[PDB]
Design a protein around this ligand. Structure first.
Ligand SMILES: *[C@@H]1O[C@H](CO)[C@@H](O[C@@H]2O[C@H](CO)[C@@H](O)[C@H](O)[C@H]2NC(C)=O)[C@H](O)[C@H]1NC(C)=O
Lengths: 49, 35
């Protein structure tokens, strides 16, 4: 739960190129697939269980 | 990534007959009708 970003699954490590103003990540199915942690500045990827 | 976004329960199953066996049947029919 990162500021209302509730979900269920594992959080693997992703290293895709983003923009400083771009923190969210969506997909074709309009689901939150890639996220940026709010405290620390790395990138996580939601993968289901 | 349109093929790999199938996390939402949408699976594609392979056919029982593979391409090599289908081609072998095709060659068998061709041989039977030529010789
Ligand atoms: C969040 O606030 C903490 C202090 O409460 C700071 O984190 C420190 O950031 C410096 C960066 O120069 C590190 O050297 C320290 O080790 C950090 N301390 C920690 C994590 O306890 C900073 O202001 C903020 N941190 C982030 C990651 O945004």
């Amino acid at each position: 739960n990162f500021n209302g970003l509730k979900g269920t699954g594992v959080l693997t490590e992703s290293n895709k190129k983003f923009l400083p103003f771009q923190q969210f990540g969506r997909d074709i199915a309009d689901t939150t697939d890639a996220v940026r942690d709010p405290q620390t500045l790395e990138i996580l990827d939601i993968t289901p269980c | 990534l349109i093929c790999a976004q199938k996390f939402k329960g949408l699976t594609v199953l392979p056919p029982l007959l593979t391409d090599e066996m289908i081609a072998q049947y095709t060659s068998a029919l061709l041989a039977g009708t030529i010789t």
